[PDB]
Amino acid sequence: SYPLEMCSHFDADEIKRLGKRFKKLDLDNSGSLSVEEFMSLPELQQNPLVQRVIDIFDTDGNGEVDFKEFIEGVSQFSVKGDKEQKLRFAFRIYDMDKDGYISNGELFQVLKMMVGNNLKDTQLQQIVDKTIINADKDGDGRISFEEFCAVVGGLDIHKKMVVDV
């Protein structure tokens, strides 16, 4: 009982398919996917950005991804999605506190999740300082989505942020 409201690029059929996968992933059949339910896939255990994706997906901040959240997060990757939506999603991978701005510490930590120990922290810290310095066209010492986009838009990485449902 009670319809579920959601915003997505998907049609009835696709939503029904996604619902099936959502069910297979929902181990404790709780109707909300958990980090551990996510980490149950071995392909994901060897991927540094799983917790960033789950967190971005987990829009109500309760720590799990409900069906509405699952569909809306997967929608960012629809082939029907626009360049901005995909870059916004990339932007949120760095924007840990969801304030709409990538800070120095947020930038260090997310990069640190990916570089690991191929860079000493001093080195990693210096390239984060200079990257922000050059991109921070407002002097607020943090990177807005606009400044972020000015830097990466030409890269067309959004063309690769597409999955099939």
């Binding site: 990916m114 570089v115 810290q125 200079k130 990466v152």
Partner: protein
Amino acid sequence: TDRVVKAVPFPPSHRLTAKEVFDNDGKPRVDILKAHLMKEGRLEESVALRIITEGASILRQEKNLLDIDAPVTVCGDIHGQFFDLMKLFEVGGSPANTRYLFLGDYVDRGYFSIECVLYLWALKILYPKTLFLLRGNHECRHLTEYFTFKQECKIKYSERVYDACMDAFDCLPLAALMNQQFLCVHGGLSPEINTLDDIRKLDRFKEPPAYGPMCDILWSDPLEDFGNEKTQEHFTHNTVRGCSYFYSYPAVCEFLQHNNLLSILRAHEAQDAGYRMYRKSQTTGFPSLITIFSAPNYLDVYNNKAAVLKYENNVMNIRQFNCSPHPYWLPNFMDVFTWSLPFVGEKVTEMLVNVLNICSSFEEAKGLDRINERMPPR
């Protein structure tokens, strides 16, 4: 602040003004300059350009072949290792009380090339008659467009600064006669340069030509078996540079005797010890050639010592020095967004594709560096 590694010094946002750079008499304020550059601060573009253009005006009035007296400190390749340059002045002596000669190659390879130039040019404006700078093979549009110097200017400043530097680089003398005993050049000899007067006749104000006496001074190298050659042949094309020539111990001995000179002092080739004393002239018992390399741990991988030459009291003393720490930069000054965004797009897409299919040594560095030591294409 959010800053994780709080202890790491952060580059100043303030860009030095003209008043902070030039005193009321128009003299560069080098201590203020050096400090700001060591922290990675920058200058207002106009102030940077003033340093370049004022420096170029002084160079422009100099001779192709400078005459320099001893005592003097002679320096080899720098290659934008700004932080080793600060150390070099410590080991060499203050330019306030010291005569200096740099053999070229201030730029490329290292990521602090515009700092080296702004700093060196500021010192030339301040000590126009005691600090001297020659042209190296990298001081041209062709090598700087191929390597990172043009990009570096674009990141830190603008192409306008790059251009001002190209014009300034065309003004750099090509050689120096030191204490009337030594011919000092970046690379070395030319089949087309027989006497010191020949260098005087060249027109240096131009991008180095693809062939010729100017290209040769900047690019020539001694044979690999210099001093023990199996032939008394003089010049053979430089298969290592892919241009100009390799000159022999006999070619040098001839040039030396004909010009009543004691030795050729040059840079251009990286040395594990920061220098190389070649075979002693049969006539004098003094090395006929000396290579001086002033970029320690060249490229962060050669692990070589650097050196400067300090001639005084008739003693030619080599002062070796080790590298110094410098800030970090990504290849080609790549920002972390552009660096990491690909891995992000790849890894998050991969994550979701998976979820959905739920239901289905010096020499080592040297040989590795070979292509980088040769004349870039066309």
